[PDB]
Amino acid sequence: MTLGDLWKRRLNNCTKEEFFAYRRTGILETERDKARELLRKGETNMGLAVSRGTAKLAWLEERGYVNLKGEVVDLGCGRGGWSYYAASRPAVMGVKAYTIGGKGHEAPKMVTSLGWNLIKFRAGMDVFTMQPHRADTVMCDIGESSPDAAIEGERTRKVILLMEQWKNRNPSASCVFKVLAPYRPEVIEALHRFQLQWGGGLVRTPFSRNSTHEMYYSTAISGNIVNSVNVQSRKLLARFGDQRGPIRVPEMDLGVGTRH
Numbered sequence: 001m002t003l004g005d006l007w008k009r010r011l012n013n014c015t016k017e018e019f020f021a022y023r024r025t026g027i028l029e030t031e032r033d034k035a036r037e038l039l040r041k042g043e044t045n046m047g048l049a050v051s052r053g054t055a056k057l058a059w060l061e062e063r064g065y066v067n068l069k070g071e072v073v074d075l076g077c078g079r080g081g082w083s084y085y086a087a088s089r090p091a092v093m094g095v096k097a098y099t100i101g102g103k104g105h106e107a108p109k110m111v112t113s114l115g116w117n118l119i120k121f122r123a124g125m126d127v128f129t130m131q132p133h134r135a136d137t138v139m140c141d142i143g144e145s146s147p148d149a150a151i152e153g154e155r156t157r158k159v160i161l162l163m164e165q166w167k168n169r170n171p172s173a174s175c176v177f178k179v180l181a182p183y184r185p186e187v188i189e190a191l192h193r194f195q196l197q198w199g200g201g202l203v204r205t206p207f208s209r210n211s212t213h214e215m216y217y218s219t220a221i222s223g224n225i226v227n228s229v230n231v232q233s234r235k236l237l238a239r240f241g242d243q244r245g246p247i248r249v250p251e252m253d254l255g256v257g258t259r260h
C-alpha cells in the first residue's frame, strides 16, 4: 500500500463539509461566471474557455512541459477545452478531436474560438477501440473519478495502453495524457514501461483539485515516476484540514476567428 492509497481512504472518510473545503483549498480556479452563462444561453461567438481544461493545458505549454505542434489528436475531448486551446496555437496545423458523448458525458461545445475551423470534432467515438492514425501530437485527458481506487487504477491503465498504441503508430509523436490514479501498482508498472521506451515524466497542474490525484504525463519532461507520485501524495495529505480557499484567477479568452 502507498501514500496515495492512504490519501484515497482519507478522502472517502470525509464528510460532505470536509470534502467541499478540502477539494478547493489552495488551488488555482478560473473565474467562469461570464463564460458559464454565455455557454448556457448558447452563444457561439466566444473565445472564453469552454471548460476548465483549457487553462490546465495552457499552463503545461506556458511552462514548457508540452510541445503542441503539427497534426494534433485530442483523445477524449469532451466539451473541447484542449481542442480549442491547441487550435489557437500557431504551430498547430490541425486537430482531430474525438469523444464518446451520450448519456452522462459531455459533447463538444461548438464555438468560433480562434482556430475552430482547424478542428474536426467527432462525437459518438470510443477511442479505446479506434484504430490509431498519423499524428505529431497526441493528447488524452481521459480518467473519470470514482470512490473506488481500483476502478480508477484500471481506468488509468486503459489510457496508458491507448497511448502505447498511438506511440506504436507514431513513435516520434509528442504525448501528453492524464494519469488519474498514478499511485496504483499496475499504473506505476505501465508508466515505467512507457518511460523506458519513450522518455517523459509526470507533473501536477495547480488547477487540479485536491480531491483528485491526477497528474499529467508528457514526453517533454523527465523525472523519477515513483518519487514524482510520492511527492504529490504528501502534498495532498498535508492539505487535509486546510481551510483556506481557492486562488481565483481570470479565465482564458483565446479570441475568435478562423485560422488559414
Ligand SMILES: Nc1ncnc2c1ncn2[C@@H]1O[C@H](C[C@@H](N)CC[C@H](N)C(=O)O)[C@@H](O)[C@H]1O
Residues within 6 Å of the ligand: 050, 051, 052, 053, 054, 075, 076, 077, 078, 079, 080, 081, 082, 083, 098, 099, 100, 101, 105, 106, 125, 126, 127, 128, 141, 142, 143
Ligand atoms: N472511451 C472513451 N472514448 C471517448 N471519449 C471518452 C472515453 N472515455 C471518456 N471519454 C470522454 O473523455 C472526456 C474526458 C474529459 N476530462 C476531457 C476534458 C477536456 N480535455 C476539456 O478540456 O474540456 C469526457 O468528456 C469523457 O466523456
